[PDB]
Amino acid sequence: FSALEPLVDLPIGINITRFQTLLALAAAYYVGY
Amino acid sequence: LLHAPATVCGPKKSTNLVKNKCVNFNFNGLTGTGVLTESNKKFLPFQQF
Numbered sequence: 001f002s003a004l005e006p007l008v009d010l011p012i013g014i015n016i017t018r019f020q021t022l023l024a025l026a027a028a029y030y031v032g033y
Numbered sequence: 034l035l036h037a038p039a040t041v042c043g044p045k046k047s048t049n050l051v052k053n054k055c056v057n058f059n060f061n062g063l064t065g066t067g068v069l070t071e072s073n074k075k076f077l078p079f080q081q082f
């Protein structure tokens with residue numbers, strides 16, 4: 001068990017529905033909802 | 034107004050800090066009443082109250 005702490009609280013009013021990811025052209029990243 | 038929630042606010046003024054006396058206090062938006070004393074409790078670097 002390990003807890004997550006806050007970092008940033010950006011007050012920007014955009015709406016987000018889809019995202020993406022970068023690769024620095026052995027990679028593995030997991031996604032949950 | 035009513036767009037891009039408030040980000041340009043006026044300056045906020047401050048006063049002196051007193052201890053061991055019944056004083057009304059407003060710590061960054063928390064209103065109350067009581068006597069303020071130093072404490073040995075330790076928070077985490079991101080916790081406020």
Ligand SMILES: *[C@@H]1O[C@H](CO)[C@@H](O)[C@H](O)[C@H]1NC(C)=O
Nearest residue numbers: 012013014015016017036037
């Ligand atoms: C969601 O995005 C739409 C634009 O597609 C925008 O008009 C609306 O204000 C956004 N809502 C929130 C809560 O961000």
